[PDB]
Write a protein that binds this DNA or RNA. Structure first.
Ligand code: ZN
Ligand code: ZN
Ligand code: ZN
Ligand code: ZN
Lengths: 87, 78
DNA sequence: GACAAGTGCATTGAACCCTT
DNA sequence: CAAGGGTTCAATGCACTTGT
């Protein structure tokens, strides 16, 4: 029945649960980078893009909004654990 | 106004003989310049469109060729 | 192990420049 | 100006390494 595990953000093939959501490697990295830079994006369309494999590279605002809506947890990106006091 | 004949993204004009997007232009250029050969990890009939054109470099390159793109229109590096 | 978090870096493509 | 050659380089995403 499950023929392909699906990224909840963009529908590409999911690689695993990242920051608490089933997502692809693209969305994982996009989310991590967005969060570590505290990026604020501005949609140059109508603030309501449907995410897919094409619209994920075209609208960062709507992609990040979707990441969060699907349950990606930004407090889990490089939290203040022993491992970070490392790097 | 035109569409990329390879993938259906918006064309930026003709490139190397065919209406094509900046993506497919860029990809064909790199492929020819470096003389790269790809291998398909399926059956050499993968979907190449605006959504998943990056999943198969072999199939994308073959489709640039079947659409009319000419290796000879790629110049030497400047 | 197997997974998820973090990293390295080659590839992508939108936005430029150049010459006809 | 436009087209169709060129180039650039931040963002991207595949493959990897690290930690449990
Ligand atoms: Zn995704
Ligand atoms: Zn948007
Ligand atoms: Zn194209
Ligand atoms: Zn293929």
């Amino acid at each position: 029945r499950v023929q392909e595990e699906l990224c909840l953000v963009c529908g590409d093939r999911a690689s695993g649960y990242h920051y608490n959501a089933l997502t692809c490697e693209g969305c994982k990295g996009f989310f991590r980078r967005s969060v570590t830079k505290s990026a604020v994006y501005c949609c140059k369309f109508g603030r309501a893009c449907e995410m897919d494999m094409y619209m994920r590279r075209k609208c960062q605002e709507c992609r990040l909004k979707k990441c969060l809506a699907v349950g990606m947890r930004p407090e889990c990106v490089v939290p203040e654990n022993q491992c970070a006091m490392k790097r | 106004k035109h569409l990329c004949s390879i993938c259906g993204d918006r064309a930026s004009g003709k490139h190397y003989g065919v209406y094509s997007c900046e993506g497919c232009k860029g990809f064909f250029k790199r492929t020819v310049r470096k003389d790269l050969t790809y291998a398909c990890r399926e059956n050499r009939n993968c979907i190449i469109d605006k959504r998943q054109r990056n999943r198969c470099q072999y199939c994308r390159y073959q489709k640039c060729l079947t659409c009319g793109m000419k290796r000879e229109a790629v110049q030497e590096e400047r």
